[PDB]
Amino acid sequence: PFITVGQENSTSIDLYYEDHGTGVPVVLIHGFPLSGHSWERQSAALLDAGYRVITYDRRGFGQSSQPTTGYDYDTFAADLNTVLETLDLQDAVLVGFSMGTGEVARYVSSYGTARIAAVAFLASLEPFLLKTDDNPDGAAPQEFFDGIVAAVKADRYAFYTGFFNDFYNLDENLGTRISEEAVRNSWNTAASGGFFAAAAAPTTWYTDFRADIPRIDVPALILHGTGDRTLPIENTARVFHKALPSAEYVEVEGAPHGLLWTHAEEVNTALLAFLAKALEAQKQKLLTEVETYVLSIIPSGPLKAEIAQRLEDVFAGKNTDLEVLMEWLKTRPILSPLTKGILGFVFTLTVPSERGLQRRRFVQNALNGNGDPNNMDKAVKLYRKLKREITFHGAKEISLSYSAGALASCMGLIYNRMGAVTTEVAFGLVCATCEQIA
Amino acid sequence: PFITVGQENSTSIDLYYEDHGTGVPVVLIHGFPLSGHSWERQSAALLDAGYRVITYDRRGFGQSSQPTTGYDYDTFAADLNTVLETLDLQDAVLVGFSMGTGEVARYVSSYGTARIAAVAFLASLEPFLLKTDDNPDGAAPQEFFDGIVAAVKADRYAFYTGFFNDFYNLDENLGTRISEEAVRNSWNTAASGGFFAAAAAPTTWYTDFRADIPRIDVPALILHGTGDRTLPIENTARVFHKALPSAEYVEVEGAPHGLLWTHAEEVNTALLAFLAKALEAQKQKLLTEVETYVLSIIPSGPLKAEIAQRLEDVFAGKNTDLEVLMEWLKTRPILSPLTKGILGFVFTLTVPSERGLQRRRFVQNALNGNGDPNNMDKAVKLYRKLKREITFHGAKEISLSYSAGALASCMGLIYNRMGAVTTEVAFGLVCATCEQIA
Amino acid sequence: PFITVGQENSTSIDLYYEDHGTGVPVVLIHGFPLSGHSWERQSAALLDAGYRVITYDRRGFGQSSQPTTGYDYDTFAADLNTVLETLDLQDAVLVGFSMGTGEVARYVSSYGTARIAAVAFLASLEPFLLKTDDNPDGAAPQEFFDGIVAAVKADRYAFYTGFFNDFYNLDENLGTRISEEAVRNSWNTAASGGFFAAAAAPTTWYTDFRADIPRIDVPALILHGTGDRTLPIENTARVFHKALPSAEYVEVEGAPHGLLWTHAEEVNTALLAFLAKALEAQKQKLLTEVETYVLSIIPSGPLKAEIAQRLEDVFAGKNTDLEVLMEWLKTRPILSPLTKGILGFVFTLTVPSERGLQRRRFVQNALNGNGDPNNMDKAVKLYRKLKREITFHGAKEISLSYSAGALASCMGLIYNRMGAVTTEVAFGLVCATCEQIA
Amino acid sequence: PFITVGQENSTSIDLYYEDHGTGVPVVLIHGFPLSGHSWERQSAALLDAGYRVITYDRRGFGQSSQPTTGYDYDTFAADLNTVLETLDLQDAVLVGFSMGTGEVARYVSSYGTARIAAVAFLASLEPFLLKTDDNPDGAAPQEFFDGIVAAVKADRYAFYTGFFNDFYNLDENLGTRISEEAVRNSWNTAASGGFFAAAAAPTTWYTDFRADIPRIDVPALILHGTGDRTLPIENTARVFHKALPSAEYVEVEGAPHGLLWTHAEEVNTALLAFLAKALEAQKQKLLTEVETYVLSIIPSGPLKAEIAQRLEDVFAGKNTDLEVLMEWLKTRPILSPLTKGILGFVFTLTVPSERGLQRRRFVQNALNGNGDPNNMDKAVKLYRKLKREITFHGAKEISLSYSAGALASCMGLIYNRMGAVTTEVAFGLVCATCEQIA
């Protein structure tokens, strides 16, 4: 599986990637000098949780092409962008490691967070590795990194065995956390990378990410090992935590750089917990926002109280039957025919349990909107535009330039054949429909 | 004449209606199982008085379409809503009878009173007909209403002759209050209705309106016959009066259910009296509305209190001389020239005595608006729409699409004796002029 | 509700009709000289059974326009055609009465039975009323009918009272089966018809339908009253039964012509029973035909036996859960991935109980068909054509000119968004898909 | 350049006008009997200060058409309106001279000051020239003006030489303040005017503007010459100042009527000072508005406070060196590269001192935008639209319909000197660029 992301002379820059599972897209960005297959312990856990794991090999590493140009985070983010755009991910999760944490930071700070739901930084490079007079929180001067570069061009293969000695802490974890077989393969992966890439990659480690940090507006997770030899914890995560206090901070005791394998159990537990927590918060933040707009059409009374509980009992996840709901919604005294349709429309999008009902008829008759030929035509012009939309705020703004009858008819288009459009965009119409009747 | 209010399969649910006369819109809603033509005696009196009679046929009755769905007051009110919206009525009058009294209450409790000036409940269903343990004030248990439904489904046509026997009290009024021919027509009307409508209509009689009663904020009239056999007065109007004491209560002695025809002379007298009283209340309520917008331009001080008194002493009908008003209005130090014109313009329209003398100039120079042909042209374009306009909300709505300079010149047109628009639209200009200074 | 079906000089020929309920379309064609409202006892029973009742007024009768041309069964069938085409009915039921039985016969013999599922003849005219030397089974010579025509032009209104005297047998059923009120309305309906229509309609009674009878290839029901005075049972249904022995024959004892009201209970019971029986037979005749083709792809073994029972337990109507079925279908040893998708596709179309499952994934991956760009394109060309198709035989023939992979991909289009197309057309693809793999 | 403002028979009434410079729109209205070109000394001074000079010729004078109807101030103001509306001026300045002062006064009392920021009356006609019994403060009786009309109709050309003798005071200023050549051109202009215009114009001089004076709510400037022979200062400006005390009053000593040329130095100083005061209130509120959008890209912190100070110290006009600014902007840790370019782009547009030196590089690399052929192509499509635009609000709205990458690249085109739009439009790009990054 490849994705063309560039062009070099006569050759085309293609990246190897894998696409597994179904659900919330989770992008795993590996680090130096491994490939996407180094996530194999994290991949298994994410697939069991019900996520969609998408891993790719960075240019010059793994099974991807090996160019001699474009080795900077501005290009790396551009490659990530191309991957996200081609695969068309919405509300995805970016998880980075080593060099991968830089790609996550650079993408959010350059391409925004229209497609991103949450981020995770495992053994990050942030905020700065280069120790200068402007930033004493560095780990080493440029003379150190230059020694590494000269070492790779000297003997790239021999450099690996020494690098992995501090990567997994073989003087501490060999035969314990990581077998001798696992070390050999990690060497093979590094050896199967680009010769020019491994010599150019370290020159990207001392890149300044200080300008990229405050552009993070999504729930973040900063995780780092205490026994990390390659990336000193005191020069990375500690000052990063100060720059982004809102991010969940987790230190793994006695964990090397490659804590993806050694301390897999600790990382996998903390990562799945963060995702289960952070995505639950936004899923619910759209539900209470919809509930706000939906209750703004219901006249104050006992029903406005009753409708809220039937919603809350659904928003929490308590089992409820639609037949009783759809019937109880029909036999409602205060509610107008128009608002019965809107409530029924919400109830279908909020319950995983459809109860095996094809569809209801009282709402279809309610969502007609007086059946005006010019009004139904204004509903299909909207329906084509909502399919191209991705965000909640995007769906609401577009569907606010149409009449209330048009929105209802447009809701009818979505009610019979959904969908196409997605639930986040679906709520954008509903929140717009209830807002127009005010 | 039809108004589309719904949709059924391939067919459209249309309602037959009539629009006669010019003046204050009066909407007459018939009851079971007649049509809009049953108001022909009340209509005639309203047409002679100078009102605007608007009658429509309920779905499944009269000349309207005959659907098999939506026979509840929420649909009945929704249909009523669509009718009011299409004709775009402001400060209209709702008169209900039998089932029609239910539609008025449900409309007010669901769609508000933005278009309603006053309401009237003739032989009401309110508050409840179904006699249960929670409400002993019912007229009969559900087994009774179900017997009627079963009687209709047996032979709806044979059911009519028996129904009309207690409807008009033929053992008391036949040959006296109502001829046999008029009864024949009432049968034909019932026979020309929907078969499903007549079988679904009785199930709406025992609807609870107790939650809708206190939502009535417009002047109401509760009228009922003492000899009503179909709707016992002790189970309807008597307990209805306790829930809404503010409503004018009038009993017609020895009057049956169909008192629209039998005691027509009595009903028309009580109804015309109610409108002349309730609208007089609103005429002055528009004057206080003008006072509201006009005082929002006057600076806080002793004058803002005195001006309110100068307005109220005129609005009530107390005798006042223009010479004192026009002179005292002229020699005011703090008030700007613009607000002098608006105050003078109001003062000229509310007092009948101009004395047949010259015109004034200080108001004329402010309301001239500099006398520019294109500015006067935006005033005559306004003048062209205001002579064709009838309502207060209509004049206001139109002159808000014009420049601030245009409003001044248009107020000048009516003051300078060029134009001659109605009193209600003139205030629409004033309220719009005062609205622009905000 | 009107349907334009013709043109006369400056005027347009429109027909009044009603469209109620949802389900299998049942067209009720009234007789002379009533309207569609005369089905009001049959309409109520059909609406409770779950059918879709569609009644219309014949040209020159009821609320329909009253032309002076086109009074023949060739035109009457043409009008029926226009109604069926405009409403777009599929697998509908034609029920005729008096003159209406002729319209049913003429339509089937001229326009085919592409839209017809079953027919019913209540008090038929078939096969011939005119008693000549060629057909002694007539009821009267032409001199009799000519006396009627002269009687109508003499006094159309007076003719009705005498006609209804033999129509309902008032000397037998008045005050018993039919009230005096019901008779008055039937008069009103006849009086509200076309003056020229009532004088031209009888000249259509002695029309020869002998050439139309053998074109009936659908399940039929011949019903007639024994006490029918207008249409002698011995001259109609008796010789009709001989011409069509396959038709269910039912005689109602002591029933007049208008047995629609008098013997409503007997007719409604026999009609609902025939429909419940006759449509069950075809619904099942498509299921066993599909089962035949579906089992023709499964290799002989224990599963071919097991798959048949899971289908039969569904075809009968026994409750079954899809989750167990879809999972058991997945974990099948002999079955290829391709055939798993087809079985899952059948299981979704056969159960009313969807169990509240959004959709399955193993079948979507199965129905891909190797994901060939040229093969998926050949699937959408088919999908546009299947929406325009109506019959089972029509769907099969079209979808037999495409590759097996195209059908699978086309089944995928229908699997994600059905539908669009309908189940009868849906099975046409399946039966074609399994047939191509042979 | 012409503006259609009316219609006369087969011909169209067009006015010649000029639109020069960029900044606050200043409309200069000339007087009798010259043209718009008589402002050439004020135009030059206003253009150097950085204003936008807009002059037009009154109907019947200069290069404008010469109709024989519509010679009154109500029409003159109407013409001015059409010009202001067509050009769509916002917060403009109306400056009148001689006969021109009446149009400014006449415009403000009819169309408001929604488009007007300030007004200026040079050698005004206000408040009244006609000496009557109501106003002894007049300049002349009706017999004087009638003598002028008769003098013009006698020999319009000969009238000019005598008129200009008192217009510029040739017996005092000839050869000193104004040459004989300048007078000759002034003669040519008057002779090229309408014959009927010069005979109808004087009849507008004695028009009453007293009702128009108190409607002036904007900062005003009353200026007049003391040695004015055509308009005696004691009968015009002296009593005008009393009617509008809030207006800045400035008398030019020893100045004739035509003080636009003779005392240009005196007028330009007083006019620019008046403009510098009334317009300054608006000048600062747009600069802070730019600052508002610019600060919306800077992350909240200590720098957001320092950057605000760096903006304010430049907007006021305090001397600052770009080398320190561009270097300090370059060596900023928190600021992203993209926002560095925008700040540098603003810093380059706000300081007049380029030092006649080189360009900067850190901004060139930021405004590149990844150098994508399609993103850069969307930048040149914008540049074509921005060269034709004039206002700040106009530039912002257009460049808000393009992508963020295009805006960056478009800012690059103008910065790398591949284009040249105005400062007001330049900020329109910046303000549009900053709004999209949110």
Chain A residues with beta carbon closer than 8 angstroms to that of D371: none
CATH topology classification for A367-438 = Arc Repressor Mutant, subunit A (1.10.10)
CA of A268 vs chain C CAs: smallest distance (Å)? 27
Residue type, B130: L
| Contact yes or no for A356 and C354 at CB 8 A | yes
* Chains contacting B (3 or more CB pairs within 8 Å): A, C, D
Report strand pairing: B25-29 vs C52-56: unpaired
| Contact yes or no for C19 and B12 at CB 8 A | no
Residue type, C215: R
D43, D64, D65, D98: the catalytic one is: D98
State which approach was used to obtain the coordinates. X-ray
Rounded to the nearest 10 degrees, the angle between the axes of helix A337-350 and helix A404-416 is: 40
| Complete DSSP assignment for B59-94 | TTSTTS---SS--SHHHHHHHHHHHHHHHT-SSEEE
CATH of B280-366, one of 1.20.91.10, 3.50.50.60, 3.10.310.10, 3.30.565.10: 1.20.91.10
| Contact yes or no for A333 and B4 at CB 8 A | no
* Architecture of the domain made up of A1-279: 3-Layer(aba) Sandwich (3.40)
The three-state secondary structure class of B16 is: strand
Q: Name the residue of chain B whose CA is nearest to D114's CA.
A: B404
Q: Beginning with the edge strand found earlier in the chain, give each strand of the sheet holding D220-225 in spatial order.
A: D2-8, D11-20, D52-56, D25-29, D92-97, D116-122, D220-225, D248-252
CA of C407 vs chain A CAs: smallest distance (Å)? 22
Rounded to the nearest 10 degrees, the angle between the axes of helix C337-350 and helix C404-416 is: 40
Residue D14, judged by CB atoms within 10 A of its CB (0-12, 13-18, 19+), counts as: middle
**Cα separations in angstroms, D114 against B335, B369, D3:** 22, 15, 21
Q: Beginning with the edge strand found earlier in the chain, give each strand of the sheet holding A2-8 in spatial order.
A: A2-8, A11-20, A52-56, A25-29, A92-97, A116-122, A221-225, A248-252
Report strand pairing: D11-20 vs D52-56: antiparallel
Nearest to B246 by CA among B267, B219, B212: B219
Residue type, D358: Q
Nearest to B347 by CA among B328, B325, B367, B332: B325
Selecting from B65, B153, B196 the residue whose C-beta is nearest the C-beta of C1 gives B65
CA of C354 vs chain B CAs: smallest distance (Å)? 26
Cα–Cα distance measured from residue A353 to residue C317, given in angstroms and rounded to the nearest whole number: 23
**For chain A, domain boundaries:** 1-279, 280-366, 367-438
* Chains contacting D (3 or more CB pairs within 8 Å): A, B
Residue D334, judged by CB atoms within 10 A of its CB (0-12, 13-18, 19+), counts as: middle
Q: Which bin fits C98, alpha (ψ -120 to 50), beta or left (φ > 0)?
A: left
**CA-derived radius of gyration, chain B:** 26
Regarding chains D and C, contact by 3 or more CB pairs under 8 A is answered as no
Chain A residues with beta carbon closer than 8 angstroms to that of B81: 336
**Cα separations in angstroms, A280 against A24, A287, A346, C353:** 12, 11, 19, 31
| Contact yes or no for B370 and D78 at CB 8 A | no
Cα–Cα distance measured from residue B116 to residue C334, given in angstroms and rounded to the nearest whole number: 74
Cα–Cα distance measured from residue B171 to residue B159, given in angstroms and rounded to the nearest whole number: 17
Per-residue burial over A23-62, b if 16 or more Cβ lie within 10 Å, else e, is ebbbbbbbbbbbbbbbbeebbebbbebebbbbbbbbbbbb
User: What are the tokens at C328?
Assistant: 């058991």
Regarding chains A and B, contact by 3 or more CB pairs under 8 A is answered as yes
CA of B156 vs chain C CAs: smallest distance (Å)? 8
Cα–Cα distance measured from residue D346 to residue C403, given in angstroms and rounded to the nearest whole number: 65
Q: How many helices (H) and strands (E) does chain C have?
A: 17, 8
Taking a C-beta distance cutoff of 8 angstroms, is the pair A345, A402 a contact?
A: no
| Contact yes or no for D333 and A214 at CB 8 A | no
**Which runs of consecutive H residues, i.e. helices, occur in A317-403?**
322-330, 337-350, 362-366, 373-386, 392-398
Q: Name the residue of chain C whose CA is nearest to B195's CA.
A: C40
What one-character DSSP code corresponds to residue C299?
P
Count of residues making up chain A: 438
Regarding chains C and B, contact by 3 or more CB pairs under 8 A is answered as yes
Taking a C-beta distance cutoff of 8 angstroms, is the pair A37, A62 a contact?
A: yes
For testing contact with chain B, the best of C19, C83, C183 (most B CBs within 10 A): C19
Nearest to B74 by CA among A335, D148, A162, A407: A335
| Contact yes or no for B373 and D75 at CB 8 A | yes
Residue type, D315: F
CATH of segment(s) D280-364: 1.20.91.10
Report strand pairing: C2-8 vs C11-20: antiparallel
**Cα separations in angstroms, C2 against A145, A194, C91, C346:** 86, 77, 23, 40
| Contact yes or no for A356 and C357 at CB 8 A | yes
Rounded to the nearest 10 degrees, the angle between the axes of helix C180-191 and helix B142-167 is: 70
Taking a C-beta distance cutoff of 8 angstroms, is the pair C104, C130 a contact?
A: no
Nearest to B104 by CA among B31, B40, B43: B31
Kindly report the backbone phi and psi dihedral angles of residue A102, in degrees, each rounded to the nearest multiple of 5, phi listed first: -70, -35
Kindly report the backbone phi and psi dihedral angles of residue B293, in degrees, each rounded to the nearest multiple of 5, phi listed first: -75, -35
| Contact yes or no for B155 and C43 at CB 8 A | no
| Complete DSSP assignment for A225-288 | ETT-SSS-GGGTHHHHHHH-TTSEEEEETT--TTTTTTTHHHHHHHHHHHHHHHHHHHHHHHHH
CA of B42 vs chain A CAs: smallest distance (Å)? 31
For chains A and C, count residue pairs whose Cβ atoms are closer than 8 Å: 22
Taking a C-beta distance cutoff of 8 angstroms, is the pair C191, C200 a contact?
A: no
**Cα separations in angstroms, C437 against C286, C294, C400, C405, D283:** 20, 11, 11, 10, 81
**Cα separations in angstroms, D210 against B420, D102, D120, D127, D207:** 28, 11, 17, 5, 9
Cα–Cα distance measured from residue C90 to residue C102, given in angstroms and rounded to the nearest whole number: 21
Per-residue burial over D121-144, b if 16 or more Cβ lie within 10 Å, else e, is bbbbbbbbbbbeeeeebbbbeeeb
User: What are the tokens at D134?
Assistant: 């109501």
Q: Name the residue of chain A whose CA is nearest to C21's CA.
A: A361
For chains B and C, count residue pairs whose Cβ atoms are closer than 8 Å: 51
Residue type, C139: A
Query: Going by C-beta distance under 8 Å and a sequence separation of 6 or more, which residues neighbour residue C318?
Result: none
Q: Name the residue of chain C whose CA is nearest to B64's CA.
A: C1
Query: Going by C-beta distance under 8 Å and a sequence separation of 6 or more, which residues neighbour residue C153?
Result: C199
| Contact yes or no for A109 and D336 at CB 8 A | yes
β-partners of residue C15 are C3
A65, A186, A228, A263: the catalytic one is: A228
Taking a C-beta distance cutoff of 8 angstroms, is the pair A430, A342 a contact?
A: yes
Taking a C-beta distance cutoff of 8 angstroms, is the pair C313, C320 a contact?
A: yes
CA of B320 vs chain A CAs: smallest distance (Å)? 44
* Architecture of the domain made up of D365-438: Orthogonal Bundle (1.10)
Chain D residues with beta carbon closer than 8 angstroms to that of B368: 211
The answer to whether the Cα torsion of A184, A189, A195, A198 is positive or negative is: negative
Selecting from A332, A334, A368 the residue whose C-beta is nearest the C-beta of B109 gives A334
Q: Name the residue of chain B whose CA is nearest to C37's CA.
A: B195
The three-state secondary structure class of C270 is: helix
Kindly report the backbone phi and psi dihedral angles of residue A290, in degrees, each rounded to the nearest multiple of 5, phi listed first: -65, -45
Cα–Cα distance measured from residue A283 to residue A275, given in angstroms and rounded to the nearest whole number: 12
Q: In the annotation, is B257 catalytic?
A: yes
Q: In the annotation, is B224 catalytic?
A: no
Cα–Cα distance measured from residue A252 to residue B164, given in angstroms and rounded to the nearest whole number: 89
* Chains contacting A (3 or more CB pairs within 8 Å): B, C, D
